[PDB]
Amino acid sequence: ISGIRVNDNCVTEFNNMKIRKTCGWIIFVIQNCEIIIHSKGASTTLTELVQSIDKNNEIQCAYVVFDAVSKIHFFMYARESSNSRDRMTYASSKQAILKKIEGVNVLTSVIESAQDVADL
């Protein structure tokens, strides 16, 4: 028992996005011991999405899905200035969220800023 659960809404809205077949994204965070949706939207570019996240210092870590229609990509975000305990929490809960969105292209490395995606 992790003490962290996935809110069913994460899966509802991920499926919404998947079935819509348009370029979109969802950001998930952990709040009060559950993984919930922080925000969701239509995409411009993956780099602009991560730039927006970089600008919000309240997002220290997150899970991000980016639906590019051809494929849906998943990564863990954690800013350089994020604390090690927070990062461990997210890393450790990563598999829990992935169980409900199996089929995504996972990036194994933690993304720390928009720079990291700006090439790939």
The pair of three-digit structure tokens given for residue 24, joined into one six-digit string: 């979109």
Q: What is the CATH number of the domain that holds 78?
A: 3.40.20.10
Query: CA 101 to CA 74: how far, in whole Å?
Result: 9
Query: CA 60 to CA 82: how far, in whole Å?
Result: 5
- Residues 76/91, Cβ–Cβ less than 8 Å: yes
Grouping H, G, I as helix, E, B as strand and the rest as coil, residue 26 is: strand
| H helix or E strand, kind and range, residue 105 | strand 105-106
Grouping H, G, I as helix, E, B as strand and the rest as coil, residue 107 is: coil
The count of domains in the chain is: 1
Nearest in space to 11 (alpha carbons), one of 99, 110, 103, 107 = 99
| H helix or E strand, kind and range, residue 111 | none
Please give the residue range of the domain that contains residue 55: 1-120
In eight-state DSSP terms, residue 33 is T
Taking CA 53 as the corner, what is the angle to CA 63 and CA 10, rounded to the nearest 5 degrees? 35
Resolution reading in Å: 1.6
Residues recorded for the chain: 120
The pair of three-digit structure tokens given for residue 56, joined into one six-digit string: 């919000």
- Residues 34/5, Cβ–Cβ less than 8 Å: yes
Q: What are phi and psi of 115, to 5 degrees?
A: -55, -40
The pair of three-digit structure tokens given for residue 91, joined into one six-digit string: 């890393």
